[PDB]
């Protein structure tokens, strides 16, 4: 038997899967002062979904460790704090209405794996003021940008000419993984 290695967290919108090498195991997860909880019992996969455990408290810092079978051989994963590290998914532009010289661009309040009651909380529900959206639009050869604290943009448009838009979900306070990928392009 050999101890797992290269343990990595793969997390987006809080769907959190622990992965490792090489390609029978059992995983345990915990917070620095909580009990250890076993997961993915005697799985032969080199991955383990831990979403249900981490969404109980996304502000918490978890540690996981993969046990190996043919005390047991094991390896610790890097510490993981969902709220500060889960990757923001690719955003989507939900709509854009024009009203004369202005245009409203709305970003879809995407759902996350975080459950509250019989429902899934949105990206807004979870980060509140911590999340902003960035807009990159063009017509002309230059680009323009606008930022917003909600899920909507209100910008000025030169009548007649055609505009294209793209948005990015951003969490500015963040150090790493602070921006989502660019959304699909959308034009008038």
């Amino acid at each position: 038997t050999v101890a797992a290695y290269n343990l990595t967290w793969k997390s987006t919108n809080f769907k959190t899967i622990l992965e490792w090498e090489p390609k029978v195991y059992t995983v345990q997860i915990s917070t620095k002062s909580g009990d250890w909880k076993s997961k993915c019992f005697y799985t032969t996969d080199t991955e383990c979904d831990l979403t249900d455990e981490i969404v109980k408290d996304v502000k918490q810092t978890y540690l996981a460790r993969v046990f190996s079978y043919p005390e047991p051989l094991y390896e610790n994963s890097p510490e993981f704090t969902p709220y500060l590290e889960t990757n923001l998914g690719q955003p989507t532009i939900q709509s854009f209405e024009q009203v004369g010289t202005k245009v409203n661009v709305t970003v879809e309040d995407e759902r996350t794996l975080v459950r509250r009651n019989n429902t899934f909380l949105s990206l807004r529900d979870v980060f509140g003021k911590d999340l902003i959206y960035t807009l990159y639009y063009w017509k002309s050869s230059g680009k323009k940008t606008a930022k917003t604290n909600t899920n909507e943009f209100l910008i000025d448009v030169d009548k007649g000419e055609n505009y294209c838009f793209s948005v990015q979900a951003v969490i500015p306070s963040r150090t790493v993984n602070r921006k989502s990928t660019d959304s699909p392009v959308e034009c008038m």
């Binding site: 345990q28 915990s30 002062s33 909580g34 009990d35 250890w36 076993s38 005390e71 094991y74 610790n76």
Partner: protein, 251 residues
């Protein structure tokens, strides 16, 4: 105990005080009315074997009250693999001459089954350690029973997180802090490392050894009781052998 607090009178009912010739010697843990589990090294220098006393329901060693019960230790059983002056197999099973009376201040700690202790208790992060040991590494002992909550570590982590000494065997496990703030200490030897699970406390460890007390870069080490459950149970069902000290094979 370094960095802990007074255990409120009655909230550490299985704690035992061991005295030789009337002097404080070590701690122990009651597990039923006639048996006490302690640490084998507590007996490396005993000469008057007829002078061991176990006191239950003790709390403040400067006052006497009706909750205290004393019993001569009729027998001290140690694994025949234990070597005085060394760390491995640090455990001893003591038979009291007369059973103690169970009261609100004197209650036995549960000896768990081996697998439950290995697969479940071993992963409850915190457990309590207690005793009348030194309050500081250099210092004197405590007058009131002191208790301290300590987190457990798997051995691979203990070693990785410690400075470069006896080896941590499979018959041991580390618990505590390496920042130099909390640990049990020498005089706590033989006392309980008790784990709380779903409404019940179980014996998972015995205060055993460590580098100094609450030394930076080190953790306390405790006898891993789960490895001795069968040993303790076979002995508890055995007939009383002549002589105080007995060495029983282990396994």
């Amino acid at each position: 105990i370094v960095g802990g607090k007074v255990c409120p009178k009655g909230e550490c009912p299985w704690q035992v005080l061991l005295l030789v010739n009337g002097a404080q010697l070590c701690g122990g843990t009651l597990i039923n009315t006639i048996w006490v589990v302690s640490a084998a090294h507590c007996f490396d220098k005993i000469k008057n074997w007829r002078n061991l006393i176990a006191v239950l329901g003790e709390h403040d060693l400067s006052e006497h009250d009706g909750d205290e019960q004393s019993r001569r230790v009729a027998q001290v059983i140690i694994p025949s693999t234990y070597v005085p002056g060394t760390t491995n197999h640090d455990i001893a099973l003591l038979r009291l001459h007369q059973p103690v009376v169970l009261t609100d201040h004197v209650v036995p700690l549960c000896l768990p089954e081996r697998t439950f202790s290995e697969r479940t208790l071993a992963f409850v992060r915190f457990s309590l350690v207690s005793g009348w040991g030194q309050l500081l590494d250099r210092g004197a002992t405590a007058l009131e029973l002191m208790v301290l909550n300590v987190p457990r570590l798997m051995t691979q982590d203990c070693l990785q997180q410690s400075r470069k000494s006896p080896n941590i065997t499979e018959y041991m496990f580390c618990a505590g802090y390496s920042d130099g703030s909390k640990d049990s200490c020498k005089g706590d030897s033989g006392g309980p490392h008790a784990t709380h699970y779903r409404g019940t406390w179980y014996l998972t460890g015995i205060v055993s050894w460590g580098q100094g007390c609450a030394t930076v870069g080190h953790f306390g080490v405790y006898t891993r009781v789960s490895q001795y459950i069968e040993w303790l149970q076979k002995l508890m069902r055995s007939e009383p052998r002549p002589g105080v000290l007995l060495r029983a094979p282990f396994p």
